Symmetry: C3
Subunit: 369 residues, 3 copies
Amino acid sequence: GASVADKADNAFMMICTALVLFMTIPGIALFYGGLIRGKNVLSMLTQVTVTFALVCILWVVYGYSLAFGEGNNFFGNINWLMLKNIELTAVMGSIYQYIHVAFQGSFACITVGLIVGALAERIRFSAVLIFVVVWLTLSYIPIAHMVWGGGLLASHGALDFAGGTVVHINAAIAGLVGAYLIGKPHNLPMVFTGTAILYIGWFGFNAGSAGTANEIAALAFVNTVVATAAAILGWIFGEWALRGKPSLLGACSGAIAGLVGVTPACGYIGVGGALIIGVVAGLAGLWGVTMLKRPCDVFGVHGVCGIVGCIMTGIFAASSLGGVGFAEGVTMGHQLLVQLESIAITIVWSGVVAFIGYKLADLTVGLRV
Amino acid sequence: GASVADKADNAFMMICTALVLFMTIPGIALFYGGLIRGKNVLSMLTQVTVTFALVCILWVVYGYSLAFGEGNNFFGNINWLMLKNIELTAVMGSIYQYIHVAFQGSFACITVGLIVGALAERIRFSAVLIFVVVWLTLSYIPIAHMVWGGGLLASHGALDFAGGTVVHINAAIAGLVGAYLIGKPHNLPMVFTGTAILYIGWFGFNAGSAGTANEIAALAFVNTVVATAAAILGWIFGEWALRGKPSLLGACSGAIAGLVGVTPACGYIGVGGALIIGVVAGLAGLWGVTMLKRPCDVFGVHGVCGIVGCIMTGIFAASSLGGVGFAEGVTMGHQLLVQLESIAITIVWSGVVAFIGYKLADLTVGLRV
Amino acid sequence: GASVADKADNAFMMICTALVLFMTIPGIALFYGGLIRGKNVLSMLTQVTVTFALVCILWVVYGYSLAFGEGNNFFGNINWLMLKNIELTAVMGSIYQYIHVAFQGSFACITVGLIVGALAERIRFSAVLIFVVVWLTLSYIPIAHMVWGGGLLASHGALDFAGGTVVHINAAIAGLVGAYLIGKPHNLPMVFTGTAILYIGWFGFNAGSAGTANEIAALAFVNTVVATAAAILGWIFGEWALRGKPSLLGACSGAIAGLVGVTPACGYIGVGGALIIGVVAGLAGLWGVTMLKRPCDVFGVHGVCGIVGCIMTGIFAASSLGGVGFAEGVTMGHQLLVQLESIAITIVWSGVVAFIGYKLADLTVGLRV
Ligand SMILES: CCCCCCCC/C=C/CCCCCCCC(=O)OC[C@H](COP(=O)(O)OC[C@@H](COP(=O)(O)OC[C@H](COC(C)=O)OC(=O)CCCCCCC/C=C/CCCCCCCC)OC(=O)CCCC1=C2C(C)=CC(C)=[N+]2[B-](F)(F)n2c(C)cc(C)c21)OC(=O)CCCCCCC/C=C/CCCCCCCC
Ligand SMILES: CCCCCCCC/C=C/CCCCCCCC(=O)OC[C@H](COP(=O)(O)OC[C@@H](COP(=O)(O)OC[C@H](COC(C)=O)OC(=O)CCCCCCC/C=C/CCCCCCCC)OC(=O)CCCC1=C2C(C)=CC(C)=[N+]2[B-](F)(F)n2c(C)cc(C)c21)OC(=O)CCCCCCC/C=C/CCCCCCCC
Ligand SMILES: CCCCCCCC/C=C/CCCCCCCC(=O)OC[C@H](COP(=O)(O)OC[C@@H](COP(=O)(O)OC[C@H](COC(C)=O)OC(=O)CCCCCCC/C=C/CCCCCCCC)OC(=O)CCCC1=C2C(C)=CC(C)=[N+]2[B-](F)(F)n2c(C)cc(C)c21)OC(=O)CCCCCCC/C=C/CCCCCCCC
């Protein structure tokens, strides 16, 4: 008579959650650790660790409730504060809701990790803490609600499997604003290791977004492998033609470009589409960081490849191109408009909230160190 | 007619086992590697690796049989030597017994890893090998039998989900004795990475102790996230008030304090209780290392937070506080006495056996390098 | 009416796949990174990353089809190019075929990683790329087809659970030829970390080769723990007797020796046999690297222990020795001949194809840097 959780899905989603947490601790920390100067590594690792703990607490206190509760088109409710009224045996989809809480919580953590790790070098410890609380509550939570919580964008049929908008575009804009309001790689092997951990954990990230160990999770898994590989080759060959020599940083940057690009598309497109998305994202990323020259720059990779991925998702979702197919009565032209709407709303929403958070921190404690 | 294993539980427990092994190799090794001097790192990594291999062999030869066989209140039997009389399709709980062997074996490995890694710098290679064999056989095995093998403490209704006594208190005392009989951080990023690996693997540690991918595993997972985060914040804010500035080492120490503290409680208490246990363990740990000043010190974190966690487990297990509830006919007052008994017996048992092991090594090969 | 995938097996195999990918990124990269000179680390990491991406693409384009399609005794077909004609819900064994694609793809990646990482220091970037394409297509693919694709060796009843021939012997010969045609450890902690990651990922490697979370996967898991531990002890004690002192490199080398040795045997033999295989492989490996002195040398460990493991697999598979038992009508003498045939064919096949690949690269771009 009651809902039943699937233990295979339980097992899969719990492990995926650990993999996503792995992306932050120590994944994204080691990544930025090798990029920034050695004199700021220790301070950066501290901020990433402390803000990570902050997000975890805020998420269970009110974060999850406002993101996945009901709710309007933008915000949920406050009936799941400290996970109250959530039975231990409550089922969300085919898993226990508690697992759903932890999984989506790890998504919030890595999103914040992307921002903090890239500007911890330049932002006061007190300031970044203030920014996190504001931006998480007023940007990440409602955007996650719009796309995954049955909000505005979800009701328009937006296609974002693992968070092209919710995570990558959302954080890229927030980081770009911060880098603006305040404006050599120390250890490349450390960058490689961070990239490596990010890649491995990204499988929990992408395939876990299926919420079950099924054929869609399988599709997202293979598409993550293919797009990442195609983006590595796409970047380094573009780099080998441009500057006449491949680099380790270029190879790692290419991998991230593909992971970001396939993030909204992995569970919607075919393997052929994944290879195309990979190559394009790899080239678009390489074009992005060079055109930006005319870890502040990685927000160019996350931004561009995120936008590219969301757009190409609206194309290669079509059954004709090997995708899973658009919803009933939806054409490619209509879907692309919805993708563009999702991108536009996310950029505006994040930019405004980020600005407010940074400004608020600047007036209370100041941003400069 | 015969017992059947659950493949979802099989899959989950095998992955959890790998995660616990991950805590030792290379988790705890990288952790102590960044703490101790650089001139002793190579020797320490060797001892940790060799003793790890030693425990693995001893465990399957007689370790598992004496720990989970039957048995009296303190020791099992010797009918499962080299896993003899254990059918390949034998089921322990809802998984194949072979998986149960490997999982509990990884618990023995990390427990020994906690000890060896912290005093490899000061103890002769020949001496630590002698100590491991003695202490594993006469301390870890019977204590594991008392709590998890249906021994003395288990029959009193002791609440220890993932090893507040069996692992943390047991090893802390053993390490404290050793540090007594023989009595600057080299790489903080290495400490952070070790802490990171320990944290990720700890999910297999805590949630895996449920023995199945169910709502209890889900509860332990979320409680591990919450308590760790609350302990990080608890430590650094206590540190920020005390010495006027947060540190990377403090953040990492806080994470370990919460992981240790929630270890016996994760599958018994509520999320609210987990946050409280986290904050308290974080503060108790910070108080511990400073009061100890008036990797020898980490045995203060493991000891104190382990004791604190076991005690607070007897409190927040109550249904009134959001816990899963005490056994039928058990009051909070009675449960706390059982918790205290478990702590007392473990401290005495470990201290005596550790002393004998160290003394025996001192008379045969000598402890000093 | 149609075939159904098992979600527990789906979950298990997807996680195992991630663990095998973990062995390459960053596992094998960090391993060779600490071995070779510091001036070649960055270039080596780049080649490993780029060739990894190359294998991933080649595998889905035609690699999987030619390896597991049908097919003759040596090659499959080309009806699964870009995974065409493979329904998303298609089932291979008890999992979705897409998962089977990714899992076997990760095996191809780590095999190539073993080769590239060991001679990236000495081989031109353009040359190794040419070699990979040739060797993967004409050596790895048909050998994998012979053993796992229902080819020649599989029809003779060859026992190779996780790739004693397909991976280890195959790559060792290819690397040995390369080292011949072109013919101090930088960071031992980096070697240890690489060894650690390889070990953890190896559980997905060995236990995943069961294709399901069953008692055979459980057996392979425990045997991986036991053989690795026994080989660590076997190596260092042989080293402690020979040179009078154990080393970190020796401990790590021992671990790899056991992992390699138990690779073809893990799902076929008993725990007692695993301990024997471990000790023997550990000693055979130590003997190998010293006799080779009268990361070029690791191909001695992979070669010897691979051969030893394949042979001892034909012995300890017997029910009398605790194994799962030979096929109906197969004696130990007959099985050993089949093992020897598998080893002989693999060595010859790989050596010829490797030679052609290296020569072809030498005539087009040249091998020397
Ligand atoms: C070429 C050059 C140009 C390129 C660059 C373009 C630049 C940007 C372009 C953006 C283009 C995107 C356009 C916006 C969204 C349209 C959605 C819509 O209107 O569809 C109606 C229908 C339901 O109807 P309804 O509106 O009644 O319900 C939803 C309504 C109430 O929500 P409620 O739950 O009650 O919450 C109560 C409360 C109050 O809420 C607010 C926000 O005050 O909520 C809070 O708590 C408030 C939140 C509290 C926040 C707390 C702090 C955080 C603050 C952050 C700051 C953010 C800054 C602003 C962000 C921008 C958001 C728009 O919520 C709204 O507000 C709606 C917007 C109003 C409005 C309109 C309208 C009505 C008709 C039209 C034409 N427009 B509009 F002109 F497009 N328009 C614009 C431009 C801006 C607005 C506000 C606006 O939708 C549904 O649910 C689903 C059913 C429909 C079936 C599927 C087919 C659909 C298919 C759509 C395809 C679209 C293709 C476009 C392509 C774009 C190409 C780039
Ligand atoms: C304020 C200041 C003070 C603060 C500091 C306090 C300091 C420390 C306090 C400790 C307080 C903890 C008290 C000890 C445990 C009591 C358990 C008990 O007695 O309960 C009986 C009942 C079953 O009855 P039974 O005793 O017949 O069976 C069990 C019996 C035989 O085992 P067996 O399987 O046959 O093995 C055969 C063989 C021989 O064994 C031994 C050990 O020689 O086993 C070996 O191989 C031997 C092992 C081989 C080892 C090999 C080398 C390794 C060596 C290690 C060295 C270790 C050093 C010593 C360790 C200390 C252990 C106590 O095993 C025993 O020995 C029992 C102990 C005897 C004894 C008693 C008794 C009888 C009654 C009383 C009152 N006491 B006692 F005075 F408390 N007491 C003390 C103080 C010490 C002892 C020995 C002792 O239990 C059951 O099974 C379950 C059924 C009951 C239903 C649930 C409700 C229960 C609820 C209990 C709540 C308690 C609350 C206390 C609060 C504490 C607050 C801090
Ligand atoms: C002490 C000192 C010595 C120590 C050192 C020893 C040194 C090396 C020893 C090696 C010893 C290993 C011996 C080889 C394999 C025997 C298998 C066999 O012959 O069994 C028959 C039966 C089916 O019959 P059939 O042959 O008709 O079918 C298979 C046949 C056709 O395949 P097809 O699908 O049509 O593909 C079409 C096409 C063409 O193919 C080829 C390759 O041109 O495929 C391509 O695309 C071609 C591939 C395209 C490649 C593209 C580029 C890649 C190039 C790589 C270069 C590789 C170099 C060469 C590699 C060596 C391979 C042998 O494929 C063949 O070619 C077969 C080989 C021919 C031959 C024979 C024969 C017939 C009888 C005998 C006795 N021999 B033979 F003398 F042993 N022999 C040798 C020595 C060499 C050859 C070629 C050879 O098998 C089955 O299927 C199963 C049914 C049987 C039931 C289970 C009980 C079995 C039990 C066997 C136990 C054996 C124990 C030996 C112990 C060894 C101890 C060390």
